[PDB]
Every structure is written in structure tokens, then in C-alpha cells.
């Protein structure tokens, strides 16, 4: 019934918010729709796998908030296997390599690839992390899809194909589905193309020992009966002195303030009194989440390592069900496994198949890419299609179609009377990730602390000390990478010398 | 509590469905979230205006279902004033004209305009009304915005500016917001560019005497206490023998079947047990409605008629708050008024202003375009911003951003166990309109009748006899319109 703050949603963001408020001495309640906490993180435990992250899993350098929170809860990380060679599989052939991006030998194609990544980052530098709609060319960039941008920038099919995979992998959506401004912001706010795409020194460097679901679980343990499971919020009433929050199972909660820690579009599942202001009312119908099936195929041994492959496969082409894999073997070297994503339209296309049918297609793909018959001999399989989740809407995160971010972006984390907004989508650094969830949850909590006069305004947004355990190497470029011309750049140089 | 069919939503679609089922002998209940019926139609009555449609208003030839339903309910239509000249206002100057489309005089510009409308209709002919995702180039066209298409097709800024206005006006959305496939389907399923854009012989030909809100109101009168107002549906449970429907005000309804007659995205406001199938689960997060403020400025007299203007203004440019107007004067000639739309991004931009501030901007615009100081002397003003409506989500209708229609379009009216889907968004002819609302409501009702074994399969989709009161003249083209080359076509000949 009565408390200081109701937190709607018991994912990492809601849990981080609730913990901060609880630690500050306030009475909090977490209303969680599901019979579990963790939301878009979910760690399955059984005999065959020990544990496996079926949702959010990876953490890395510069994600200091999630690392600090997890450390405080008694969790440890381990490094994803990247000892051996990565594979780029292109036009039915595998090309082993080292470093974050597949090397390109053709001088024209090399110029094109170099210019693509460089230009993505160049454009990103013009986009404020906390206000992407303030970019000088915000409207121009927001009014085109990533497909249009790639069509303009990529003078080779090779670059366009890799760039397309990059988009599909980063935001589980098609290039034609997403705003160029939003995608450029998304990459920039993760630290750029290298940081977002890298395993070593990037977002995919590490996993939590025992699974990421432990973050939300351990906070629930701390909060005790303050977390209410199977309480989907249906109604928020702000017409009276205290905010009234009603759940589907016929309970009423009364609070001074509310934190909405759910994906923005899932705000639609709540009836509001008074109605939301126009901009938020429409915004929450304009912001879908992406589409992905996370699939883990288990083997007797990490046989790929014997062939000097680390387990990372970047797989181009429509026919391949999975475009990206990582070694998901336990740090001890057992429960050998390959994690793969079925992305965007393929998640829709292949969802119709049975689990056994998908397992077969994945094994046949992996056998081909790894050139290994051992890939046809899985011992176990786990998967999760996040498109089917009523209380997620998809994974990993919310994407913005063309035109939306400039028109509606401003209201994403704007308070509505006594409702404040958390959730990873409202973060300014690693939004879309567990890191962003922590940033947003703690920021929303501190907005309320400020509203209560408990902290000054300049304490709402708080910097985070760098992790001592996961230090961040800087992202560097070479002279040639910075100054080599683009393809049209080269053609202008030829135009000049010929004239 | 117990009935045969629960209809969620008391707009025209839900009401049409409920009436059909009721008329067939079934026990129906309509659960309506608002304290009124009509949904995206709303007729305001007061002294100053008598009545005014603040939502959906216009009907026209080929919209035979809405015309038949309204007639049965005892309603009549009258013609929107198009006796005098239309105005195209371009680069700060008014150009009076007759016919549906503003004339172009520059020869290259003429070819460009001609080709644009023609090409829209040519492309539409390849798009099945009942399955736009089955167009031969469905994926290619769905993967580009209308902005990209216009950028390709329009060799003149003149054509591009008019084409942009056309998109903004038809679907209350920006060209860059919407799928080309979806928009081309949308136009085609209204009968093409001429039919959708025309007043005389098109979608804007007529209004209902006393307002369109009377359609939903009069069906409510027929149904009596079967219509439950202020019953927002929050929960649908299909795990048991009978479907359970719960409302926000703590009531439970039990039925054999449910009709969802709400905008697709508003399905999100309902918690489902068991959860929806994946495709619908994601679809209902991908389908926003457009943005519009409908504004009606009242005057002592229809003064524009004295200058041989009918009151229709097509107004190009970013600065103009309103891009399109029609004479909203009563058939009797009194309550003189101009109806204008503030469209898409302008609805967002100008919503911040006060009602009085918007009135001033509109009057000053109209004074300019009509070349009349009388426009500065309004006697009354009414407006409605549909973006603010929790239980609409916007107006006029749902649009599909790039990539959505091909990926998710198939599930729009696919039944979920015992839930059937009505609402104008599910129609195949004049989807987006009151006509589409009627088509979809009656079709959904007949799907349930078939499920109950009361009618055969071939009776689910039913043709409609042409209105005798509003006959449709065919859409015709001239030899030159058909065969004149595009701008690049002319360049190839050169
Ligand atoms: C799904 C997924 C996510 C993911 C990823 C791979 C997949 C398949 N990989 C990641 C990774 O490697 N590293 C990383 O940092 N992130 C990765 N992601 C994304 C990540 O999981 C998310 O960014 C993060 O978990 C989001 O946290 P947040 O707290 O912001 O949101 P949530 O997890 O969705 O929690 C929301 C909770 O709210 C409940 N809910 C929803 N509606 C209601 C109502 N009406 N009432 C009460 N509760 C509600 C949900 O059940 C959920 O628990
Ligand atoms: C807004 C608008 C619409 C419009 C237009 C101009 C404006 C400003 N001009 C039109 C015109 O000139 N001619 C025409 O034919 N159409 C025009 N439009 C669109 C037209 O109004 C719509 O196409 C039509 O009204 C749609 O009817 P439909 O029955 O399909 O949908 P609805 O009116 O939105 O009704 C839905 C009802 O459902 C209720 N609702 C919503 N959620 C719930 C829940 N959870 N539980 C119970 N009821 C719910 C809504 O309140 C509504 O009544
Ligand atoms: O889970 C993941 N999220 C990502 C985002 C960008 C690149 C790779 C990945 C993953 O493997
Ligand atoms: O209400 C309207 N809907 C329309 C659709 C297309 C063109 C004009 C109009 C209107 O005036």
C-alpha cells in the first residue's frame, strides 16, 4: 500500500533505482509484471548448461556503473574467448583474421571500408550524447534511414554488406527500419565504432560468472518483500495528493513519486489519469524494440580452438540464419558452446520453425563456417526469442524510425508530474545496455531525491570512477586511417590531375 | 457479465460490428473507454456553431457502406461547397483554379506533375488491396520512405512540394516517416490519386447533416444499455472455455468471442493471457497514428464566395500553419466557417501555442491567401488536437514506417484464438476512413457468425450496392495525360 516511491519494473534499471532509494533511507516498492526479476536479462540454470544468459550478457571497458554495481553485489567477470582467430565468412568462404574488423586487401575496397567506419565516427562527434536532436544536421540525418546513408557512403558492395551486418547486430533492426541520426547517436554514445564492435577492449569483452541475472536477483535479495512479483501495473493516477498505482492482480499502491523503469513503448500498457501530455502520448507508440533470437549450441569440447579459431564468426549473406557468434564456453573450459544471434527480419522469418529445426540449421551453418564436421554433433541447445515477450517487446533495445528522435526525443526522460523515467533507453552512455540501465535507474532515483530536497541539483547526474578490474584502453587510429581518401575522394584527386 | 460477443471500442467500427451481431440475434456488449461513443469521430454541439465535426467528417462516392449505414440510421448528407474557384497558394501568391489538381504552366513542370500523379497510380495497380505485401516489388517499395520515392520521381521542386503536401494531407505524416509501399497501397485502396484528393466526385464530397458523430450515437441508441461507457478494457483472458474481458473500473465480462475495434497500437493498453503470438506482439508497437489539429474558424458570412473562391485552399510552404482548407459553412449558408488542418510536424510544433495564438495565425494566413481583410474578423473558433487523445493515439489513422507492412502486415486482421479484429486499419477499401470502419466492423462480425456456423465462408466478405444518393462518376484520364513523357523520358528522347 503506502510508500515513498513506487518503481515500475524490476529489471536492472528499476532494481538499481530501488537500491539507491532504499540505501538513502526511503521506503520503496518494486512492482514487477513477471514471476521473476531481471527483465531483458535472464539467466537459465539447469544441469546441462549449469547457467546461461539468454538475454543481456556482455560487459566491457567504459561500462563502469554496471561493473561497480555487480562488484558491490559480490559478482565477478571473466573474459570472452578471443585468444584465437576470428572468422569473416563472405560469399560462402571463411577468412580468418585478428583485430576487431575483418581486414580488406583490395585497395579500392580498403579505402571504402576505412572511410565508412571513419565517417560513422566523424558524424557521431557532431551529435551530443544527452541531446542528439541538437546535432547541427539533426533533421537532415533524422529524415533518412541507415539504408539511405549506407547507399550514399559505401562505394563497394563489400563495405555495404559489412555495414549492414553492423547495423543489424548493434540494434537488431534492418538498415531501412532505423533513423540515421538515431543510429549514429547510438554508436557514438557507446564510444564509437571500435568500442561497440570489439570483444577485446569493447562491449563484448566480458560476462558475469554465474550470469547477469544475478544483478537483479541479488538486489531483490537486499530489498526483501519490497519486490512484488506478478504485479503488472495497469493504472497510474496523479490527480490526488499521493500518486496511486494499480496492478492487474487488484492491488493499490500509494506513493509520493513513481519511477517508470520499463521500455518506453511498454508505457502503453498503463492507463494514465490525467492523460499523458500529447508528446509523450504519441512518442510511446513510435518506439519499437528490435528483433532477435539468442541461440546457444553446446558441444563436447570447444573444438574450434584446436583449429585456431576463437569461436567468433561474422557471417555475411541472406542464407545464413545467424550473422554473428561468440564462444560461450565457461571460463573453466567446460560446457563448450557457441552463442549466435538470429537478427532482425531473420528472427521473424525463422521463428516459424521448431527448436529442433533451428538447431539443425545453426549446426549446418557452423560446420560450414568452421570447416568442421564436429559442429554437426551438438550435445545440447538453448534459445530465446525475445520478440514473443509481452513485457519486453523485443531485444536488445528500442530503436527510432526516421523522423521520430528529432520530433519526440526531447520527452524521453522528461518527468510527467511525479513520474520519473528510468530504463536503459533514457541513458546517455551505453543506452541499450545493462550499463545504461544502471545510469538511468540511479539518475531517476536522484531526480526524486532532488525533488524531495535531499540532494542539490548538481548531484542528479553523477560521474563514475573507472573500474580497476576492467580498465579501458583508449581507441586509437593510425595516420593512414585518418588521412586516406574515400573512394569519391580518390576520384576527385584523379579528376584534378587529369584536368 | 455474460454475453455472446464483447466488442472492444465504440467507434464506428465497433458500433457497426455490434449492430450487425445484435441484428442477427446475438447478445452483444460494447465496452467503450471514453464517456462518449464515436472515437475518432466527434461532433461538438453549441450555440455558436450549432454542430461541428472535430474528427472524421467527409464522405464521398464509392464509400457505399458508410452511406448505407448512415441512411438506415436516418441521416442525410450535403455537398461541401466547391461551386467557386479553388486556390493554390505558392511562394506567397494565390493562384485560383478549377478541377481537382492545381494547374501548372511551365512545360517541364507540367510533365513532372503529370508524371508524378500518373506514376503513383501506375505503382498502385501492382498492389493488391487485400494483401499489399504481395506486390511484385513489395520489399523494394516497403524499404524506402515516401521521401526517397519523391526524391527519385520529382525532377522539379514544384512537383515535390505539392507531392509532399499530398502525403501530409492524406496520412497526416511526413514523407520521411512513412513506407512508400504502404502509402501507395493507401492511395490505391481509396481508388487512386483523383478519388482520394477530390472534393467533387471524391472523398471530400459530402458531410452528414448534424455531424458524423450521429452514426455512433444512433447505434448506441439502438443498442441501449448494451453500450458501457467509461469501461476501458485492461485485460483479455482466453485460457478458459469462455473469454474473460476485464475493464479498468473493475468489471468482468464473459463472452464466446471478442471483437477488437480499436486502433492496432492501442491493443498495447490490454494485458493478454496467454500472451499474444510474437508477430502481433511486436506489430502493435510498430504502427503509430498520424498527427493533426483540426481547426474551424467562423465568420459572419462566407465572404470568400463573393470573390469567386469556394474556400478550398492548398497552401505550400513551411511557414503556413495550415496546408489545406475547405469551406465548412452549413448547407443553409449560415455558420460560415473555414475548416483547416495543421498537419504532421506542424501539429507538434504549434501545439505549444494557446488556442487564441493559433486562431490569430490562421486568420492572418487566411487573410493573405484569400486576399481579404474579412478573414481577420472571426466570430468564433473551435479546434481539436488529436495527438493528445489517450484512446485514439492520433488522427486520421495508422501509418506504417519503412519495413513494417511487409514484415507484419499479414497479422493485422488475423484472429487470435477467439479475438477478431475490426477497426478501419483492417479494411481493404477506404481503410483510414469511416467507410473502412464500417467494412471492417461488419467483416469481423461475420467472421464470428461463420465461426458459430451461422453463415457460410463466402458470406464473410460482402459486396456493397452503390448508393443511389451519391453515385460515383468514373475516374478518367486524357490521351496526353496517359502518354506524355516524364522529365527523364523527355531527356531520353533528346
Ligand atoms: C534481450 C537481450 C538484451 C541484451 C542482449 C541480448 C539480448 C538477447 N545483449 C546484451 C549484452 O550483451 N550486454 C548488455 O549490456 N545488454 C544486452 N542487452 C540489453 C539489456 O538486456 C538491456 O539493456 C537491459 O537489461 C535493460 O534493463 P532495463 O531495466 O532498462 O529494462 P528491462 O530489463 O526490460 O526491465 C523492465 C522490467 O519491467 C517489467 N515490466 C514491463 N511492463 C511492466 C508493467 N506494466 N508493470 C510492471 N512491470 C513491468 C518487465 O517485466 C521487466 O522486468
Ligand atoms: C481524427 C480525425 C479523423 C478523420 C478525419 C479527421 C480527423 C481530425 N477526417 C475524416 C474524414 O473526413 N472522413 C473519414 O471517413 N474519416 C476521417 N478521419 C478518420 C475517421 O475518423 C476514422 O477512420 C474512423 O472514425 C475510425 O473508426 P474506428 O471505429 O475504426 O476507430 P475509432 O474511431 O478510433 O474507435 C475506437 C474506439 O475504441 C475506444 N477504445 C480505445 N481503447 C480502448 C480500450 N482499451 N477499451 C475500450 N475502448 C477503447 C476509443 O475510445 C474509441 O471510441
Ligand atoms: O550481445 C551483443 N550485443 C552486441 C552489440 C554490438 C556488437 C556485438 C554484440 C553482441 O554480441
Ligand atoms: O479530412 C480529410 N481527409 C483527407 C484526405 C485526403 C485529402 C483531403 C482530405 C480532407 O479534407
Amino acid at each position: 500500500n503506502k510508500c515513498d516511491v513506487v518503481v515500475v519494473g524490476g529489471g536492472i534499471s528499476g532494481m538499481a533505482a530501488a537500491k539507491l532509494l532504499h540505501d538513502s533511507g526511503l521506503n520503496v516498492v518494486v512492482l514487477e509484471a513477471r514471476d521473476r526479476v531481471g527483465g531483458r536479462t535472464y539467466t537459465l540454470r539447469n544441469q546441462k548448461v549449469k547457467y546461461v544468459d539468454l538475454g543481456g550478457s556482455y560487459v566491457g571497458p567504459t561500462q563502469n556503473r554496471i561493473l561497480r554495481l555487480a562488484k558491490e553485489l559480490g559478482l565477478e567477470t571473466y573474459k570472452v574467448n578471443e585468444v584465437e582467430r576470428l572468422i569473416h565468412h563472405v560469399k560462402g568462404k571463411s577468412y580468418p583474421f585478428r583485430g576487431p574488423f575483418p581486414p580488406v586487401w583490395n585497395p579500392i575496397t580498403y579505402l571504402d571500408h576505412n572511410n565508412f567506419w571513419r565517417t560513422m565516427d566523424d558524424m557521431g562527434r557532431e551529435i551530443p550524447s544527452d541531446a542528439p536532436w541538437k546535432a547541427p544536421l539533426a533533421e537532415e540525418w533524422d529524415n533518412m534511414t541507415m539504408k539511405e546513408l549506407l547507399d550514399k557512403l559505401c562505394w563497394t558492395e563489400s563495405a555495404k554488406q559489412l555495414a549492414t551486418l553492423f547495423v543489424n547486430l548493434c540494434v537488431t533492426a534492418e538498415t531501412h527500419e532505423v533513423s540515421a541520426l538515431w543510429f549514429l547517436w547510438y554508436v557514438k554514445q557507446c564510444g564509437g565504432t571500435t568500442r561497440i564492435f570489439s570483444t577485446t577492449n569493447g562491449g563484448q569483452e566480458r560476462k558475469f560468472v554465474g550470469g547477469s541475472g544475478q544483478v537483479s536477483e541479488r538486489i531483490m535479495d537486499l530489498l526483501g518483500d519490497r519486490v512484488k512479483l506478478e504485479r503488472p501495473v495497469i493504472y497510474i493516477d496523479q490527480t490526488r495528493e499521493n500518486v496511486l498505482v494499480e496492478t492487474l492482480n487488484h492491488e493499490m499502491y500509494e506513493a509520493k513519486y513513481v519511477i517508470s523503469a520499463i521500455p518506453p513503448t511498454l508505457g502503453m500498457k498503463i492507463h494514465f489519469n490525467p492523460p499523458l501530455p500529447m508528446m509523450r502520448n504519441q512518442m510511446i507508440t513510435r518506439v519499437p524494440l528490435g528483433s532477435v533470437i539468442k541461440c546457444i549450441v553446446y558441444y563436447k569440447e570447444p573444438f574450434w580452438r584446436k583449429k585456431d579459431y576463437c569461436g567468433t564468426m561474422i557471417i555475411d549473406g541472406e542464407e545464413a540464419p545467424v550473422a554473428y557468434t561468440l564462444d560461450d564456453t565457461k571460463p573453466e573450459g567446460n560446457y563448450a558452446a557457441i552463442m549466435g544471434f538470429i537478427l532482425a527480419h531473420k528472427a521473424r522469418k525463422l521463428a516459424r520453425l521448431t527448436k529442433e529445426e533451428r538447431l539443425k540449421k545453426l549446426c549446418e551453418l557452423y560446420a560450414k563456417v568452421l570447416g568442421s564436421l564436429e559442429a554437426l554433433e551438438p550435445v545440447h541447445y538453448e534459445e530465446k526469442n525475445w520478440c514473443e515477450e509481452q513485457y519486453s517487446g523485443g531485444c536488445y533495445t528500442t530503436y527510432f524510425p526516421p523522423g521520430i528522435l528529432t520530433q519526440y526525443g526531447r520527452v524521453l526522460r522528461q518527468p510527467v508530474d511525479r513520474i520519473y523515467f528510468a530504463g536503459t533507453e533514457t541513458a546517455t552512455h551505453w543506452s541499450g545496455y545493462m550499463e545504461g540501465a544502471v545510469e538511468a535507474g540511479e539518475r531517476a532515483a536522484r531526480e526524486i531525491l532532488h525533488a524531495m530536497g535531499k540532494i542539490p541539483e548538481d548531484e542528479i547526474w553523477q560521474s563514475e570512477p573507472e573500474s580497476v578490474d576492467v580498465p579501458a584502453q583508449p581507441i586509437t587510429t593510425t595516420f593512414l586511417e585518418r588521412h586516406l581518401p574515400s573512394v569519391p575522394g580518390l576520384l576527385r584527386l584523379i579528376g584534378l590531375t587529369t584536368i
Side-chain angles (χ1 to χ4, degrees), chain A residues 97-133:
Chain A
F97 72 99
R98 291 183 197 268
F101 299 95
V104 178
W105 281 97
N106 181 317
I108 298 307
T109 314
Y110 175 87
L111 293 177
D112 201 40
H113 280 242
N114 181 249
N115 181 248
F116 169 71
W117 301 112
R118 184 176 64 201
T119 301
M120 293 292 281
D121 290 326
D122 288 347
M123 293 174 89
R125 283 181 215 109
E126 291 299 316
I127 302 168
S129 287
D130 61 346
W133 50 87

Side-chain angles (χ1 to χ4, degrees), chain A residues 266-325:
Chain A
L266 293 188
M268 284 286 287
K269 306 210 76 69
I270 302 167
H271 297 246
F272 291 91
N273 188 23
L276 297 173
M278 152 200 341
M279 294 300 286
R280 190 176 190 87
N281 181 50
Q282 287 207 310
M283 180 275 286
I284 62 174
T285 69
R286 283 158 155 75
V287 288
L289 286 86
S291 301
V292 62
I293 313 175
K294 185 171 193 184
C295 308
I296 305 92
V297 180
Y298 294 82
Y299 294 102
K300 192 178 183 175
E301 292 166 349
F303 63 84
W304 47 94
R305 299 177 183 184
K306 300 184 314 197
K307 298 198 174 183
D308 200 34
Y309 300 142
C310 66
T312 300
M313 294 174 263
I314 302 163
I315 309 164
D316 239 347
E318 181 58 33
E319 321 72 40
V322 166
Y324 192 72
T325 69

Side-chain angles (χ1 to χ4, degrees), chain A residues 20 31-32 48 91 101 189 243 282 328 395 430 473 485:
Chain A
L20 191 157
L31 301 181
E32 166 59 42
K48 288 283 174 62
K91 288 225 80 180
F101 299 95
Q189 62 94 34
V243 182
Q282 287 207 310
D328 208 46
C395 260
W430 296 98
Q473 309 291 133

Side-chain angles (χ1 to χ4, degrees), chain A residues 204-460:
Chain A
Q204 287 64 246
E205 195 181 81
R206 289 161 185 266
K207 294 162 61 91
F208 291 114
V209 175
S212 69
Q214 294 177 109
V215 177
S216 293
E217 288 160 2
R218 290 186 181 199
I219 299 171
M220 173 167 65
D221 295 342
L222 293 175
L223 293 168
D225 65 13
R226 294 172 188 84
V227 182
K228 318 292 182 189
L229 302 176
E230 301 191 83
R231 267 75 166 197
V233 171
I234 56 161
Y235 182 62
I236 294 172
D237 182 343
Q238 302 195 80
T239 60
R240 300 169 200 270
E241 208 204 338
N242 298 323
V243 182
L244 295 168
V245 184
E246 189 175 20
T247 61
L248 186 60
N249 63 313
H250 313 102
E251 292 177 349
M252 191 70 64
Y253 295 84
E254 203 171 309
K256 297 181 177 66
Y257 302 95
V258 173
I259 293 172
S260 175
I262 65 184
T265 192
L266 293 188
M268 284 286 287
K269 306 210 76 69
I270 302 167
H271 297 246
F272 291 91
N273 188 23
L276 297 173
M278 152 200 341
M279 294 300 286
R280 190 176 190 87
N281 181 50
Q282 287 207 310
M283 180 275 286
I284 62 174
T285 69
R286 283 158 155 75
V287 288
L289 286 86
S291 301
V292 62
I293 313 175
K294 185 171 193 184
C295 308
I296 305 92
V297 180
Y298 294 82
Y299 294 102
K300 192 178 183 175
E301 292 166 349
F303 63 84
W304 47 94
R305 299 177 183 184
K306 300 184 314 197
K307 298 198 174 183
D308 200 34
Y309 300 142
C310 66
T312 300
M313 294 174 263
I314 302 163
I315 309 164
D316 239 347
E318 181 58 33
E319 321 72 40
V322 166
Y324 192 72
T325 69
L326 296 166
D327 189 338
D328 208 46
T329 305
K330 299 280 184 294
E332 292 79 13
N334 52 4
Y335 306 88
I338 298 289
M339 185 287 304
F341 290 126
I342 301 173
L343 299 162
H345 84 276
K346 295 173 185 176
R348 272 98 68 168
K349 182 175 78 180
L350 304 175
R352 284 173 274 174
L353 305 182
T354 67
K355 184 187 180 172
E356 295 70 26
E357 279 166 346
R358 276 183 298 277
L359 171 61
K360 180 174 152 73
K361 284 185 177 300
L362 268 57
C363 289
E364 289 176 351
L365 178 62
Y366 298 164
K368 218 187 210 173
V369 176
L370 296 170
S372 303
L373 295 171
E374 301 177 80
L376 302 177
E377 310 293 319
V379 295
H380 192 68
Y381 181 59
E382 298 287 350
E383 60 167 27
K384 173 93 182 120
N385 189 336
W386 288 87
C387 305
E388 68 200 11
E389 291 297 302
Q390 180 165 209
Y391 296 111
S392 292
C395 260
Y396 326 127
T397 195
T398 297
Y399 73 84
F400 282 69
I404 304 308
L405 184 62
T406 52
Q407 289 291 295
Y408 295 93
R410 277 171 186 87
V411 301
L412 200 56
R413 53 176 181 265
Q414 179 172 124
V416 176
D417 190 0
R418 285 156 284 167
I419 306 172
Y420 292 81
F421 296 96
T424 192
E425 284 86 353
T426 63
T428 63
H429 189 219
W430 296 98
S431 178
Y433 292 72
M434 298 182 279
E435 169 69 12
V438 181
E439 186 209 301
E442 297 184 356
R443 183 267 308 150
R446 293 189 306 257
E447 285 185 304
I448 288 167
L449 292 176
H450 172 72
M452 295 175 315
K454 294 192 179 294
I455 66 168
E457 195 183 74
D458 68 328
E459 282 178 28
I460 290 167

Side-chain angles (χ1 to χ4, degrees), chain A residues 125-194:
Chain A
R125 283 181 215 109
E126 291 299 316
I127 302 168
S129 287
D130 61 346
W133 50 87
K134 292 188 168 169
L137 310 176
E139 286 204 336
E140 181 180 342
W141 295 353
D142 202 36
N143 293 352
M144 66 191 301
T145 65
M146 273 303 299
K147 187 186 175 80
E148 304 177 53
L149 182 56
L150 300 191
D151 285 347
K152 285 174 185 277
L153 288 182
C154 300
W155 285 64
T156 64
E157 276 308 298
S158 174
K160 187 186 290 190
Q161 283 156 4
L162 183 55
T164 299
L165 188 153
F166 180 73
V167 171
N168 297 167
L169 179 58
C170 283
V171 301
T172 61
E174 304 291 328
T175 55
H176 61 259
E177 287 172 341
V178 309
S179 158
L181 176 67
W182 172 80
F183 185 78
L184 293 165
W185 166 81
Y186 192 85
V187 172
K188 176 261 183 58
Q189 62 94 34
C190 294
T193 57
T194 299

